[PDB]
Write an enzyme that holds these catalytic residues in place. Structure first.
Site, PDB file in Angstrom:
ATOM      1  N   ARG A 109       0.849   6.835  -0.139  1.00 42.94           N
ATOM      2  CA  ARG A 109      -0.026   5.873   0.487  1.00 42.94           C
ATOM      3  C   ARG A 109      -1.215   5.718  -0.503  1.00 42.94           C
ATOM      4  NH1 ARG A 109      -3.290   2.515   1.918  1.00 42.94           N
ATOM      5  NH2 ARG A 109      -3.788   2.033   4.119  1.00 42.94           N
ATOM      6  N   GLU A 117       0.022  -6.102   5.742  1.00 42.93           N
ATOM      7  CA  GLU A 117       1.340  -5.490   5.696  1.00 42.93           C
ATOM      8  C   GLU A 117       2.513  -6.407   5.983  1.00 42.93           C
ATOM      9  OE1 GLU A 117      -0.945  -1.769   7.481  1.00 42.93           O
ATOM     10  OE2 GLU A 117       1.210  -1.340   7.551  1.00 42.93           O
ATOM     11  N   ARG A 172       2.799  11.418   4.006  1.00 39.42           N
ATOM     12  CA  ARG A 172       2.669  10.587   2.805  1.00 39.42           C
ATOM     13  C   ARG A 172       1.555  11.139   1.913  1.00 39.42           C
ATOM     14  NH1 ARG A 172       1.545   4.705   5.217  1.00 39.42           N
ATOM     15  NH2 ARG A 172      -0.029   5.956   6.325  1.00 39.42           N
ATOM     16  N   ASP A 220       0.803  -1.224   0.000  1.00 35.91           N
ATOM     17  CA  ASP A 220       0.000   0.000   0.000  1.00 35.91           C
ATOM     18  C   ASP A 220       0.834   1.271   0.000  1.00 35.91           C
ATOM     19  OD1 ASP A 220      -0.814   0.129   3.635  1.00 35.91           O
ATOM     20  OD2 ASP A 220       1.094   0.120   2.585  1.00 35.91           O
ATOM     21  N   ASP A 242      -6.746  -1.143   2.071  1.00 34.92           N
ATOM     22  CA  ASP A 242      -5.993  -1.660   3.196  1.00 34.92           C
ATOM     23  C   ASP A 242      -5.440  -3.005   2.771  1.00 34.92           C
ATOM     24  OD1 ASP A 242      -6.550   0.443   4.943  1.00 34.92           O
ATOM     25  OD2 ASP A 242      -8.187  -0.625   5.951  1.00 34.92           O
ATOM     26  N   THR A 243      -4.123  -3.135   2.777  1.00 37.80           N
ATOM     27  CA  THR A 243      -3.476  -4.383   2.403  1.00 37.80           C
ATOM     28  C   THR A 243      -2.826  -5.058   3.615  1.00 37.80           C
ATOM     29  OG1 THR A 243      -1.375  -3.255   1.986  1.00 37.80           O
ATOM     30  CG2 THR A 243      -2.885  -3.454   0.165  1.00 37.80           C
TER      31      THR A 243
END
Length: 136
Positions: A30, A38, A82, A16, A35-36
């Site tokens: 970002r 992590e 970010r 992400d 939502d990945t």
């Protein structure tokens, strides 16, 4: 109307997160609305499908010949500095590709930064129906 701008890949950081050269300055981006799992998660470290998501994002941006960033309508940077954007590799949105593959869930959206939310949720519903990765 949202506008696409050119950028240059510097380094893929996580599924992400990618660092890009944008307007002459290196910047960490970002991926908006996704939502990945992590690999560099501050509390868990490496989660399931984390290596898969990171690899997918990395290959997608590294193989691209043209990368473009698309900011949404609200704030453009999060509290960690970010950039918040939709990233495109040769015209295909990386954020959507991850969701379509079942390698990312759609995150809690906050207006006005939610322009592509319904588009993304539609791809997520399809990934669920196909019971891909995260959804199997």
């Amino acid at each position: 109307k949202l506008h696409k701008e050119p950028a240059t890949l510097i380094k893929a950081i996580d599924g992400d997160t990618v660092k890009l050269m944008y307007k002459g300055q290196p910047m960490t981006f970002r991926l908006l609305l996704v939502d990945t799992p992590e690999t560099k998660h501050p509390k868990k470290g490496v989660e399931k499908y984390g290596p898969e998501a990171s690899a997918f994002t990395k290959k997608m941006v590294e193989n691209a010949k043209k990368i473009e960033v698309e900011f949404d309508k609200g704030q453009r940077t999060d509290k960690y500095g970010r950039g918040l954007a939709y990233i495109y590799a040769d015209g295909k949105m990386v954020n959507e590709a991850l969701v379509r593959q079942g390698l990312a869930k759609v995150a809690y959206a906050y207006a006005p930064n939610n322009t592509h939310e319904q588009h993304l949720r539609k791809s997520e519903a399809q990934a669920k129906k196909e019971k891909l990765n995260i959804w199997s």
